[PDB]
């Protein structure tokens, strides 16, 4: 099957929704800037590292 | 270019299809709760931290 | 809300174009083998394990 990709502005919109994204879609918040996986009963956060600027 | 992200109940539905999946896609499999990215000649695992539970 | 996965050969490529990648896009470069998700103002990099070859 396939899944994708959701967003949100804030984690609090996020969360407001997340019983309705399914298991396997991706899920970024961006004033966080927190990245996580929906799973079964919950959901995994993706480890990233520090922001790259982008190029000038 | 755009790829995605597509998703198996399993390990042995997912291996069996991996072949098929182009570089840069990611691959969910919701039994071990794992996510991976496409490569070169394989695939490499997405690090994962502990689940949140979902909002009571 | 949705996003996506976008790809490129090279970083180099990825580069030139990362200004127009929407906030909460994943981002793959094949030659390098990285994976990024794009932020405000920035990108970060997702950490990665090592490649598991495809099954034979």
Redesign the interface.
Known sequence: ?????????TRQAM?GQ??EVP????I?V?EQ?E???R?????????????????R
């Open positions: 099957g396939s899944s994708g990709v959701r967003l949100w502005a969360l997340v019983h298991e396997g879609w991706l970024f961006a800037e990245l996580y996986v799973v079964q009963n919950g959901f995994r956060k993706v480890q990233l590292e520090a922001r790259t600027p982008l190029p």
